[PDB]
């Protein structure tokens, strides 16, 4: 559990930047939804970065 929680807190800090993280109800279900969202966003951001750098070359 602690690795998923650290990945979510790190990802939320990266997404919110200097904005204070809004408090939320931390439970199993909200952490699972946030974990899937964080994995999906990391995968999509990698794919988008590769496309953007190829479009610059092209």
């Amino acid at each position: 559990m602690d690795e998923k929680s650290t990945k979510i807190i790190m990802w939320l800090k990266k997404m919110f930047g200097d904005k204070p993280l809004p408090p939320y109800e931390v439970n199993t279900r909200t952490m699972e939804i946030l974990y899937q969202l964080a994995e999906w966003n990391e995968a999509r951001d990698k794919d988008l970065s590769l496309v953007t750098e190829d479009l610059k070359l092209k």
Partner: protein, 102 residues
């Protein structure tokens, strides 16, 4: 004079035989950054779309595999594969939802 005359013997027929083996498109140089002349055949747009590139048969197999039509722009390839990965992730979510509902 005998030695230098022997070097030049059949000179025309030697050059023509070597010239016959050359790919004319490989001579055509283009500058991307003003300083570096690259053969036009090394440009990724041409490697991927030019019928005379030695890699054309490979990129054709990749386009058939990814179901990208041959009339499309070669810059659309990475964006199409990224949208196919988005589609795979969506179908994975959908199957997970439906299996949980069942």
């Amino acid at each position: 004079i005998i030695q230098e005359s022997q070097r030049l013997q059949d000179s025309i027929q030697k050059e023509v035989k070597h010239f016959s083996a050359i790919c004319l498109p490989a001579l055509l140089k283009v500058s991307t950054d003003g300083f570096n002349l690259l053969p036009s055949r090394e440009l990724s747009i041409n490697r991927m779309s030019n019928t005379h590139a030695p890699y054309y048969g490979i990129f054709k197999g990749i386009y058939e595999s990814v179901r990208l039509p041959l009339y499309k722009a070669p810059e659309s390839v990475l964006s199409h594969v990224a949208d196919m990965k988005k589609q795979l992730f969506f179908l994975r979510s959908q199957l997970s939802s439906r299996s949980e509902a069942i």
